[PDB]
Amino acid sequence: SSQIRQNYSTEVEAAVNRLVNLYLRASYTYLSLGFYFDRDDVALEGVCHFFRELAEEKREGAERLLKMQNQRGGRALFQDLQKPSQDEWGTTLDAMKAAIVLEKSLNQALLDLHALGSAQADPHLCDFLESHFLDEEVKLIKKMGDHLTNIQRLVGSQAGLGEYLFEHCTL
Amino acid sequence: SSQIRQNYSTEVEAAVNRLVNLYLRASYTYLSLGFYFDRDDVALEGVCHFFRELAEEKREGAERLLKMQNQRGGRALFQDLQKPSQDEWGTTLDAMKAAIVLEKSLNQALLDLHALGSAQADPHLCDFLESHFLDEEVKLIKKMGDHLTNIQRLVGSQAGLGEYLFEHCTL
Amino acid sequence: SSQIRQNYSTEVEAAVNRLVNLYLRASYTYLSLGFYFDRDDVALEGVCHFFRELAEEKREGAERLLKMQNQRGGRALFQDLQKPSQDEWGTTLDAMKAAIVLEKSLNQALLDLHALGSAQADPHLCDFLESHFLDEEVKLIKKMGDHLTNIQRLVGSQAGLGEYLFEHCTL
Amino acid sequence: SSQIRQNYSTEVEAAVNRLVNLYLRASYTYLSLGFYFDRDDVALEGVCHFFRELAEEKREGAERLLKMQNQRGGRALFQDLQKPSQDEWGTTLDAMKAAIVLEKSLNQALLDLHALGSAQADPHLCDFLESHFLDEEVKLIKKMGDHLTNIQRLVGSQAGLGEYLFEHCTL
Amino acid sequence: SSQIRQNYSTEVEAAVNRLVNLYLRASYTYLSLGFYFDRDDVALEGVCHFFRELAEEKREGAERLLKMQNQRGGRALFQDLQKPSQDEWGTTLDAMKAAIVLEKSLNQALLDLHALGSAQADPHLCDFLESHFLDEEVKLIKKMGDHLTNIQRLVGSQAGLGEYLFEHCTL
Amino acid sequence: SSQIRQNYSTEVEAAVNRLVNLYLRASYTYLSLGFYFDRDDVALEGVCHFFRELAEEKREGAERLLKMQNQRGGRALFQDLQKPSQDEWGTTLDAMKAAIVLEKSLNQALLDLHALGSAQADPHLCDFLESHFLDEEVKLIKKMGDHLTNIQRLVGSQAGLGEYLFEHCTL
Ligand SMILES: [Au+]
Ligand SMILES: [Au+]
Ligand SMILES: [Au+]
Ligand SMILES: [Au+]
Ligand SMILES: [Au+]
Ligand SMILES: [Au+]
Ligand SMILES: [Au+]
Ligand SMILES: [Au+]
Ligand SMILES: [Au+]
Ligand SMILES: [Au+]
Ligand SMILES: [Au+]
Ligand SMILES: [Au+]
Ligand SMILES: [Au+]
Ligand SMILES: [Au+]
Ligand SMILES: [Au+]
Ligand SMILES: [Au+]
Ligand SMILES: [Au+]
Ligand SMILES: [Au+]
Ligand SMILES: [Au+]
Ligand SMILES: [Au+]
Ligand SMILES: [Au+]
Ligand SMILES: [Au+]
Ligand SMILES: [Au+]
Ligand SMILES: [Au+]
Ligand SMILES: [Au+]
Ligand SMILES: [Au+]
Ligand SMILES: [Au+]
Ligand SMILES: [Au+]
Ligand SMILES: [Au+]
Ligand SMILES: [Au+]
Ligand SMILES: [Au+]
Ligand SMILES: [Au+]
Ligand SMILES: [Au+]
Ligand SMILES: [Au+]
Ligand SMILES: [Au+]
Ligand SMILES: [Au+]
Ligand SMILES: [Au+]
Ligand SMILES: [Au+]
Ligand SMILES: [Au+]
Ligand SMILES: [Au+]
Ligand SMILES: [Au+]
Ligand SMILES: [Au+]
Ligand SMILES: [Cl-]
Ligand SMILES: [Cl-]
Ligand SMILES: [Cl-]
Ligand SMILES: [Cl-]
Ligand SMILES: [Cl-]
Ligand SMILES: [Cl-]
Ligand SMILES: [Cl-]
Ligand SMILES: [Cl-]
Ligand SMILES: [Cl-]
Ligand SMILES: [Cl-]
Ligand SMILES: [Cl-]
Ligand SMILES: [Cl-]
């Protein structure tokens, strides 16, 4: 009955709504991460800012998906947004570990949506994922792995601290 | 055990977390409102934009509250965000009615938080509500009542349409 | 006993004070008109603005008269300002009808003051009315008649609405 | 029956209309003060200008109140504006005394409206008074007391004139 | 006998003079803190500068209070300023602890002045505290708690130093 | 035990701390002078401003001395700051008399510190006094004597007022 809908499976429509939920959950998680690091007894405002920026990116992804849902003539359906998995997020290392786990769950969701879009022969969907999501996730996951390595190095030892300072201050 | 906390009741702390939830729910509602009006079979993009702007304002209010929670040494606690009350929002009139009901529920929540802050002799809280929330809500509710009146006039009759056009095009 | 007073009758002096009162009453009326249209259940802000501008013009006329009274060595005397004739002003059509009636009462007052100034052989008074009031009133009354005609056309019928839209949007 | 009205008592609504009247009366008083000082036999144009500026401020206060009345869903009701208490205002000292008495009556009215708003648990009203009226009145009353002191000094004696000139011309 | 004084209790007048003393004491304390960190055998000029800026803020607060005292028609009365509690201030951690204790004593004084102003039904006083003092203190106390946490982290351990460097140099 | 200290007597060190106290007392006195002239019943804002500027200069002198104390490796020690000698300061003439007495006490203190520095063969101290204090005091004392003469002339008589006006308005 939708007058623009063409080659748009009910399966993809549903999976897109689920991915919106996944992205909004991710944004909520990053909001909680950021405010934790803003606590006076944590007080790492740069970490708060890093996570605040990610909450925004994740919300923007959801909005992009919702725009696409309408462009294809699907019906956006919203579900409860579950609260984040933790109320306190431990150290910078713990938080960046939780963040890469999250990004990896979104990345797997995008890959699963491509597999569905391929099975449904929906190239507009594939193009959309490619254009806005797949490379963005890979780039973000690389940066977070980079961060994990640096944090481990900085917290580990004077040899690690040493090499980090040399790179940052001499190079 | 918080080293900055002063004159900040556990009651207000809790009510602030609940109000964050209320504001994030409101933002989610407005996201659903906006995307509904973006549907090709609805296609009122200006309405989508009006509600998109409100989703942003409501999120910003929640973020402001969360910032304040930390500034007072309270602990931000997040809860499930319930999905909006409807999946489809009817006419522009229905949506603007749902929106004023929502804003009125937030306004009542702010008034209830002032009553608690007064009972707890917490003037920083009162000041904060005054500075960022009370007048903003009143102004928004006035605009929405204005909108309700105009929509009713425009949809009602040629006499109503007539007066609207005169004001918009002659005055 | 006034050392600048020349050729300035007590009759004109009195009539000038009465006209000040008439102009301030008019300004008060337009204040009430404008705020009525600002009511959320009326919500024609352009009409509010049109009347707000007229309240200003009418006050300025009174101030001009008061300045002139002093320039001639008359004594400005103020009287009670009666409240406007109505508390609610009905439709845009009703309000613009009330406004033209008002302007016509001021115009008749100016004409009556010219007749007195002529009988008193006071050409400075005539010049003053000509320079600041007579043409202003005529222009305003023409605009209001124009408005009455347009409002009647717009509220009347699809043929009227039709012609208005053609003029506004095509021409 | 007003669709925006929330937490807005009939008592405050009425007191706001009365305060509008009080502010418009004040503006009318200052108009009479200013024109008196413009009389050729008085000829203190700076005093005329000081009072003209106050007539404007007082009108603006009334307009602010009327805007607020509508924003809260109250009904602006206008009453007769009584003419000022005097037709001639004596010396600069007499006029500035009459002016501080007036400002003190408005200030007391604002304080009485806060007491009512507090009894009615209306924090938007309190905020509004704070934001636009309480500090403005205090500042104005301080300036007028300053003026009274200076006028008394200047009119009093050569020792007073002396100190005024030293401050104005040397410092 | 003061010609501007209205609704200004002798109790608030006295408490304002005491708070001026409290603020000037605070400014003197911060002067001593800053010069200590300027000692060649301490040599933390950034800490000296942080405290120099606070000495200025505290003096400005006192001056603001004194201005307000005169605006209300109270009489500014000055008392001995006691010298700071210490002649030497230990480590950066010790000094920032002494500073938050101080700010908390000023904050409690402001809250006690609000309680008095409320008991005296003095809304201009409440507004003044809100506008210039309550939020400023909260913001300053949050920053100092942030500083305490960071200093403890940096002085504590290589894991703490590690996380601080990551936030500052990577994020 | 100070590693920079050279040719810096304990006698000068102590006298510098005492002079800091003297300068801060002077600044406090000028704060009280300035606020007195800001009283509505005094209302000489130019006098308030003149004294406010001097309070700043005196504080700056103390800060300069404290900086120098550290540059020489002395230990800044702060004492109680006694409140000013009066709570009310009479006429402009009385205040300017009190001010020149004060400046003369500071000037004598500087001269006494030079005598000590000379006896201690401390040329850096002499240079410092010369560079920042001796000429500044002389210039300030000359200006204040000038002011005393003018105030006496202006308050004295029409012949005095006469000559002042001629100089200010014709020359
Ligand atoms: Au954050
Ligand atoms: Au942040
Ligand atoms: Au694909
Ligand atoms: Au595909
Ligand atoms: Au770097
Ligand atoms: Au570096
Ligand atoms: Au570096
Ligand atoms: Au939208
Ligand atoms: Au939109
Ligand atoms: Au409150
Ligand atoms: Au409160
Ligand atoms: Au329009
Ligand atoms: Au139009
Ligand atoms: Au038009
Ligand atoms: Au209006
Ligand atoms: Au308007
Ligand atoms: Au005529
Ligand atoms: Au004539
Ligand atoms: Au047009
Ligand atoms: Au048009
Ligand atoms: Au058009
Ligand atoms: Au005037
Ligand atoms: Au004037
Ligand atoms: Au209030
Ligand atoms: Au209130
Ligand atoms: Au001056
Ligand atoms: Au002068
Ligand atoms: Au001069
Ligand atoms: Au310093
Ligand atoms: Au410094
Ligand atoms: Au208060
Ligand atoms: Au209060
Ligand atoms: Au940094
Ligand atoms: Au760094
Ligand atoms: Au770096
Ligand atoms: Au001053
Ligand atoms: Au001043
Ligand atoms: Au010397
Ligand atoms: Au020497
Ligand atoms: Au001069
Ligand atoms: Au002159
Ligand atoms: Au002159
Ligand atoms: Cl955040
Ligand atoms: Cl495909
Ligand atoms: Cl939207
Ligand atoms: Cl409170
Ligand atoms: Cl208006
Ligand atoms: Cl004629
Ligand atoms: Cl005027
Ligand atoms: Cl209240
Ligand atoms: Cl310092
Ligand atoms: Cl109060
Ligand atoms: Cl001062
Ligand atoms: Cl020497």
Describe the structure.
- The structure is cut from a larger assembly and holds six copies of chain A (171 residues).
- With 171 residues, chain A is mainly alpha-helical.
- Chain A has one domain: Ferritin, core subunit, four-helix bundle (Ferritin).
- Helices cover 77% and strands 0% of the residues of chain A.
- Chain A contains five helices and no strands.
- The first copy, chain A, has helices at residues 10-37, 45-72, 92-119, 123-156, 158-170.
- In chain A, helix 3 (92-119) packs antiparallel against helix 4.
- The first copy, chain A, is elongated and about 65 Å long.
- The N and C termini of chain A lie far apart (62 Å).
- The structure holds gold ion (AU) (42 copies) and chloride ion (CL) (12 copies).
- Residues 114, 117-118, 126 of chain B line the site of one gold ion (AU).
